[PDB]
Amino acid sequence: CAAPCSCDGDRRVDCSGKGLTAVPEGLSAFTQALDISMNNITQLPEDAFKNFPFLEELQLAGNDLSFIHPKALSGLKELKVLTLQNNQLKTVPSEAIRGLSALQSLRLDANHITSVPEDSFEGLVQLRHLWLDDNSLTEVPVHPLSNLPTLQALTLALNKISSIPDFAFTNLSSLVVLHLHNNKIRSLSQHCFDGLDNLETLDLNYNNLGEFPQAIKALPSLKELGFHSNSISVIPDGAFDGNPLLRTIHLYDNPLSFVGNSAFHNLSDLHSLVIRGASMVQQFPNLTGTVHLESLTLTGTKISSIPNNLCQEQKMLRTLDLSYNNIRDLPSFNGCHALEEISLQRNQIYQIKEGTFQGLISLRILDLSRNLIHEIHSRAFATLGPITNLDVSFNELTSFPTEGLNGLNQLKLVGNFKLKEALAAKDFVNLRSLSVPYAYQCCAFWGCIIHCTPSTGAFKPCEYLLGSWMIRLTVWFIFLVALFFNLLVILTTFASCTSLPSSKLFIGLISVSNLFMGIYTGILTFLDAVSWGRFAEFGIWWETGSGCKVAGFLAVFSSESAIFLLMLATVERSLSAKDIMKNGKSNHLKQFRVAALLAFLGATVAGCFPLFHRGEYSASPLCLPFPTGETPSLGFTVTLVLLNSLAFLLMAVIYTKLYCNLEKEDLSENSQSSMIKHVAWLIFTNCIFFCPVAFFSFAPLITAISISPEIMKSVTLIFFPLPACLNPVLYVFFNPKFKEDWKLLKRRVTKK
Ligand SMILES: *[C@@H]1O[C@H](CO)[C@@H](O)[C@H](O)[C@H]1NC(C)=O
Ligand SMILES: *[C@@H]1O[C@H](CO)[C@@H](O)[C@H](O)[C@H]1NC(C)=O
Ligand SMILES: *[C@@H]1O[C@H](CO)[C@@H](O)[C@H](O)[C@H]1NC(C)=O
Ligand SMILES: *[C@@H]1O[C@H](CO)[C@@H](O)[C@H](O)[C@H]1NC(C)=O
């Protein structure tokens, strides 16, 4: 073949991508096809193809062509395919292409053409396909297109066409497919499409059609119609009367609000129908004379009733979607043997009867989430086929049938807060994914393969409430010591019918306050003993029942009142000490008693606060407010922990102020030295035992520290109730005054 390009036999020359600026020479006149694309031929001289009389296929892609001689293409009587894409013609070379009698395919896209001469395309009696996209056309060339009776495919995409007048294609009797997508069409005249009796495919996507066109009524042979991504809002009745042969309708991405009831009648071959956002539709459409729907979708409407004949008329219905509507009752689905997917989420369905899903033998996915369902017949799913995915989440369910669900794979139950029963593992042997309203229902299918959610962490144990043996014995040790010692201390102080000083007074209520904490641990110990190895059964009942709220109230009330009381004792000790060298007598005894009642009131208010909020006490089976995986209490928990910690410093620095103001020689023999030293230990142990609880509560706010859940659980069971038992222990063994009171009690007991 002639240099620098190659000849692919069969009278074919591949001479493209060589940067040639002119028609190559040396090629035989017997050549049938020439491809010289990707070159730099910008101007074509006259008779540039003189010595190729038998050329049938000519390609001129990407040549930066600007000017063509009118007689340049003379003698190409056998030319059939002519491509001129990616050039700068800016106008259709009507004079150059006048003599192409046998031309069949003309490609003129991507040429920045802004206008077309009226005499263009004359002599193109053999044309079948014409490409005119990617240009700057502003009007439909009615007259130039009127001279192509044999045209079959016409593309005018990606242009600036604004409107189409009447009878624009009144000659294209042989047209088959017409493309007009990605244009600026905003108005279609009534008779713009007249004469296109042979048209089959029409594309009107990405336009500005504000009203449904009535001109499509004159297209009896239409098969594919697409006008999606437009401004059409209303589709009136009788729109598709003149086109009985559609197969696919594209109308998505439209401001569709109202649809004619009858509009989609007698649409044979209609294989799909998807309508979304039609908020004004209130009645189910007629879908009559249409028995070949494969997929149906009606979302965002006001439909409240579904006709019974839906499963008696539709034959090849495969997928059904009616979500986002006002459907309240469900008709019998018997007959829809080809149905596979049903989506009915976000409706007003309240019950499921036995006959609702009798006839579905090929159902695989069934969605009923976010409804008002409160009862389901036990045999509703009995007569089902290969059901694979089921979703009835966010409902008012109280029970759940299991018959016929052995083949289930995905199941969602979240939001059914009134559902208490635990699902049996033997009824869902093929389960792989499961979500349940309460984590305690995931204990059967831990997954030891079954991503059960929410995960049953250490905070929500399945086997044992307390967990390890070491933890359990300590809580028993704490409970017995707190109950026995606090009762003893309470009795001795209040059994002496003598004058009660303020310093002795605050000791008593601290023991009383710590007694309730011992009671709180008693509830946990007995609950653990009863639910030994079977806590998952009682988990739901305990948290949701009033038992958790009562136990949770005691823990908050006993803990908060303990800090407030001993803080008052610190203030009392400082004030009583000051009055010694100043006045020598304390006369605030009545005032302190009032503050003690006020101190208890503050604890009661704090204890009752989580009761008003829903689920704050139910976050953990321990009934303790903690930020771990709980926000309702996150705002509440921080308030308490800062309040307790804040109270520490003011009651601490006053002791240092008292200690500094107290001379070292005043503690030698004064009876106040023992009293001041006893509190000095209470401020110590209570402070250190509160930091681990306090600092773990700050852990969720610090993302840089990841603490595994079981660690918080162990310390909270060993440190939070620890001060309750330790406070009386120090008093009985280390306070010399208690021994004197013990002597007084023994004498009264012996006397009585
Ligand atoms: C094609 O060749 C001409 C020769 O004058 C040159 O001016 C032009 O830049 C070339 N085009 C490309 C794309 O190389
Ligand atoms: C082509 O269109 C012109 C103008 O509408 C008309 O006069 C002529 O008869 C048409 N030829 C046909 C329809 O074959
Ligand atoms: C469907 O076509 C039949 C036969 O032409 C006609 O009788 C019937 O009324 C049509 N459907 C509608 C739109 O009612
Ligand atoms: C469906 O079309 C038939 C045509 O005869 C009509 O009688 C019927 O009322 C229509 N139904 C609805 C609800 O559009």
Author numbering: 29 to 476, 519 to 822
Paper excerpt:
LGR4, along with its ligand R-spondin (RSPO), potentiates Wnt/β-catenin signaling by recruiting its signaling suppressor, E3 ligase Zinc and Ring Finger 3 (ZNRF3), and inducing its membrane clearance. Cell surface-expressed LGR4/5, members of the class A G-protein coupled receptors (GPCR) family, have an extracellular domain (ECD) comprising 17 leucine-rich repeats (LRRs), followed by a seven-transmembrane domain (TMD), and an intracellular domain (ICD). ZNRF3/RNF43, LGR4, and RSPO form a ternary complex on the cell surface, which relieves ZNRF3/RNF43-mediated suppression of Wnt/β-catenin signaling and thereby potentiates pathway activation.
LGR4 ECD adopts a typical horseshoe structure comprising 17 LRRs (residues 58-455) flanked by N-terminal (LRRNT, residues 29-57) and C-terminal (LRRCT, residues 456-525) caps. In the upper layer, the LRRCT helix packs complementarily against the extracellular loop (ECL)1 helix from the TMD and the adjacent connecting segment, with the Y468 side chain inserted into a small pocket formed between the ECL1 helix and the connecting segment.
